[PDB]
Amino acid sequence: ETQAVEAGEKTVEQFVQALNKGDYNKAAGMASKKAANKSALSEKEILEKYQNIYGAADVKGLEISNLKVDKKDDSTYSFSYKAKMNTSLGELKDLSYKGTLDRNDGKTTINWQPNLVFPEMEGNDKVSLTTQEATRGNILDRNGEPLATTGKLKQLGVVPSKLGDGDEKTANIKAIASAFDLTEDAINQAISQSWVQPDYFVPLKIATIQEVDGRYYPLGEAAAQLIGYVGDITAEDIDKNPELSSNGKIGRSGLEMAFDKDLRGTTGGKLSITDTDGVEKKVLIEHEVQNGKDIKLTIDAKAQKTAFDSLGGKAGSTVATTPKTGDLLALASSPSYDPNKMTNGISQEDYKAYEENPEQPFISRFATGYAPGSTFKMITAAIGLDNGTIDPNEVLTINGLKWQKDSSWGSYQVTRVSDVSHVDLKTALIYSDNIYMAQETLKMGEKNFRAGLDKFIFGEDLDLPISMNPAQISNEESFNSDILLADTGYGQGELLINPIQQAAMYSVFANNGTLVYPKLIADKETKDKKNVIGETAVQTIVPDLREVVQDVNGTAHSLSALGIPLAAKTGTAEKENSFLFAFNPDNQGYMMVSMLENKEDDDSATKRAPELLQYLNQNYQL
C-alpha cells in the first residue's frame, strides 16, 4: 500500500488496457530501454511482436486478477498476476504472468520480455495458427437418397491457347460446343472475359475437364424451391456473423438456408507456441473441426421428381402426404430454376432469364396461400353434418345456373355449371354445386360455421421450416355480410389456404375426423388434434367422394380408368385456376393436393394426376 508500489500496479494495468484497445504502440511506450537487465527489445521490435501475434490471433478481452507488485530494489519491483483472454479460437483461462518493473526518476516502466505475450514463450519463440474448414452436411430423403450433397464434380472447361488461329478457332469452338451440347457464342463471351489469360483453365459446364469440389442437387429444379441453393460468402455476411470463413458457401433459400447452422459445421483450429523454426512447443488451444450434420426428410425423391415433371412446366404445385402420420412425400412447385447453375455458376443470360419469367419460378407455391375453391365443400358439409344443419337426404330443388337469397343482393349471384334440379348432399359434391352449398351454409350461419372452422388450424403456424403466412377465413374477424358468408361456403370469398395447409385440414377424412399435422423432418413425432369433425360426418362424406370419380357425371370420372381406389373432390376458379384433392379411402396410405395456376385451354389438375397417383397408390398402403 505504497505510492511507488501502486504506481507499478497502475503501470501494469495501463499496459494490459493498451493491449485490449489494440494500441500496441501505446503499450510499447511503457518498455524499458533494451538492456541486459531491463527490456529485451526496442519499442519498435516490441510493437511488431504484438501486431504479429496478438493481432493474427485477435487477442482481446484481457482480464487480470490477483495483481501483485513487490519491491526488490530501489529501482526494481517484481509483479505477478493471473489472466484470461479471448482469441479467435476460444478463451485462454488461468494464464500466469510474471515480470519486473524499472523505477528510475519517478518513472515506472516495464522490462519487456517475450513471456508477456504468452507465459511459456522464450527468446526467439514464435506462434502458429492453423484453421481447417468443415464439410457441409447432406439433406436426405426418407430413404437416404441425397437431395443436397457436397462432392467432386466433373467440371468442363477450355484453354484459349489449345484452340485455333482464325478458322481453326471459330470452327474448333464448334466441335466442343457439340460433343457437350452448349451454345457456340457463349464460348466466345467466356474466352474474352476480363480475367481470362490465354493459359488459364476456363470453366463451362457442371477442351479439358478437372475435378472440382462443389455443392450438388441431384433433383435439380424438381426440388429447387424446397431445398434451395447456396452462395459465395460475402463480406456483408461476415458482418452479420464474423464466425464465417471467406471460403465456404452459405444457404440462401429453402432448406439450405433454414438449416445452415446444422449443415455448415464448425471450423477447427489450433493455437500453438513454437521455437524459431515452427516446431510446436506448447499447444494453447485445439478445437478439432466438427463437420456438418446430415438431415433426413420425409420426402420421397421419386414422388418429388414425378410430381414436378407431371406439371409439364405450367404454373402450379403438388403436395403429397401419408395422412395418418403427416409425412410430406413431395413439395412440388412449377415453374422452377436450376439450383446447380445458381450454386456452381450460371451464365449472365440463363440468370437474367429466371428473373423476368412472369410466372415466377423462385416462388414456393406449395406455401403460397390461395382460395381453395370447390375442394373446400368437403369441409362445409362436414360442419353442417356435425351440427344437424344438413340432412344428407333433404332434397333441394334448384332451377337454372344463377341464384340469390333475395333481391337485396343486387347483382351478386351464386353460379353453377350443371343444371341438376334435385340436389341432395351426394349429388352436390358429385357435380360441385356451388348453390346447394351456398344455401346449406346460410342455413347454418356464421356462428355455427365458425364453430366448425375454428376447430381447424386457421391462424396457426405449423412446426415446419418453411416461410408461409397462416391460413385465414376472412380479412377481418367477422364476415359482416351474407354474400361473403356464402362465397366462403363454396371455397372463395376471403379464404386463403396454401397447399400444405389444405393437405392438413383434409387429413380429417383419412383419420375418422382427427386432424394430423404435417411432418417434414424424418424423425420428429407425429402431432394431431383429435375430434375436429365427427366420425359419422366422415363416413357420410367419403362414400360421396368416391362417387365424384365413379359416377359417369362425376367431376373426376376420368380417373376411374386407372382402376385404383380413389376418393376425391375437384375445383376451378376464375385466367382460370384448377384444383384436385385425392386420397385412398381403402387404406388411407396417401393423400395428394394438386393445383394448376392459370390453366391452359382444356388442361386440368385432374388430367395430370394419374402418373403420381399410380406410384403413391402402390408404394403407400398399410
Ligand SMILES: *C(=O)[C@@H](NC(=O)/C(=N\O)c1nsc(N)n1)[C@@H]1NC(C(=O)O)=C(CC2=CCN([C@@H]3CCNC3)C2=O)CS1
Ligand atoms: C368449385 O370450385 C366450382 N367451380 C366454379 O364454380 C368456378 N368456376 O368454374 C368458380 N367459383 S368461383 C369463381 N371465381 N369461379 C365447381 N367446380 C368445378 C370443378 O371442380 O371442375 C367446376 C368445373 C366443372 C364442374 C363440372 N364441369 C364439367 C366440365 C364440362 N361441363 C361440366 C366443369 O368443368 C365449376 S363448378
